[PDB]
Amino acid sequence: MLEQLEKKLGYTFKDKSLLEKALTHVSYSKKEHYETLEFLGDALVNFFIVDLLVQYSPNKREGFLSPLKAYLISEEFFNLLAQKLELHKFIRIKRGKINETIIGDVFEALWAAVYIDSGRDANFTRELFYKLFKEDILSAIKEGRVKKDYKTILQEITQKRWKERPEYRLISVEGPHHKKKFIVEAKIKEYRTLGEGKSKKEAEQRAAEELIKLLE
């Protein structure tokens, strides 16, 4: 029920249809779904995060803050924030069709919905977002839970040492086409490592993470 979500959010909607739209997947309704709210929500939440980063590190450069932002505005991090709202239990979509992509999109749409319902009060919405997640975000940073970009880190290591970039190649692919599992190999000089994932990029990130350790 919507009331339970409003209680978790700490905000009561004037237009309940706005909240319903944010929670509804297009496959469930072609008239009122979250796609447009998600578009707005992405820009709104990205702004909330960037502002928080700059506020607590006013004298830090873009090279320090952007890597943090890159993870904090990611679908993965939004799924972690969404857990606090048990968002998955309010999404209107066929049973068993919910995945991280959907949860991440609804999270963004939900915030656009609050923003619009509040009369487009950006200040209000930003502070409500912080009331709920500011400490979680800052703590994730301080406690080292921000994920590293292993593919980039790896090529910086190899480019500094050998002025060369690592190479990745597919070793194997298995499972149904809509649920493939990839195994790739990362290599630099005579060092080689393996990585697995649901996409080639994910498998490469895993292999890079291992190759870095090996080089050390």
Place this chain on the structure above:
Amino acid sequence: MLEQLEKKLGYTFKDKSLLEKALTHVSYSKKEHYETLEFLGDALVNFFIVDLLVQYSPNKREGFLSPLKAYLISEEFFNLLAQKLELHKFIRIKRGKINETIIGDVFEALWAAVYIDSGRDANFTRELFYKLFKEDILSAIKEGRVKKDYKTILQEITQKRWKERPEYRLISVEGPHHKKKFIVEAKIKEYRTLGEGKSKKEAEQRAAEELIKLLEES
């Protein structure tokens, strides 16, 4: 002179150093420059533009609104909006060092500066931005004064017709290394065209535009 910019903006700063920072390039000052404000400004202005798009097309999908956003938050469009502020005349950087990149960065930083100076009043800053640029943005959209993405349009034409994508290759490069001019060739099936630019991508965009015309005329 800052007062002249404040007059154009319709906003008077409480902390003049914030405005100065937004107008100063790092090569001019390594202590107080616009780099961090630019980082914040990009996110702030992007939000202003996306909100405006959704507000005037609440029932339009992301596939319709994002292509518009892609142009409206681009450095190119920001340079056009900046002209209204004669922004180039207020930037603190060595004479003759100003270019489109700098102007676009200062534009974003300037808005982050207003946002911060106003006590982080996003609502107020959003409306100040609209007071100055809302009509300019909506008119650009309605009139079709939005840069077309020729490379993407071209591959959609070729993929629909032949389920194939065009190919690009470098034909020649000349001029100083810091001021190169590229000539590239775009091709699909037996159709080929040339394009030139200051970067390979720019040359490819021009070659793609010519190829789209060649296909339509065929």
Place this chain on the structure above:
RNA sequence: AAGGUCAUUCG
């Protein structure tokens, strides 16, 4: 529609 893949554009 969801997963993957190739490609392209914008930030």
Place this chain on the structure above:
RNA sequence: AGUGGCCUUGC
């Protein structure tokens, strides 16, 4: 962030 071609699955 958007889009197009291709494979798979879903209806």
Place this chain on the structure above:
RNA sequence: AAGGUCAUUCG
């Protein structure tokens, strides 16, 4: 720093 180039990550 500014231009270009190759590559990589995030939206």
Place this chain on the structure above:
RNA sequence: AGUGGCCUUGC
């Protein structure tokens, strides 16, 4: 949006 290697130029 960030970053790294390379070429050029600027101080």
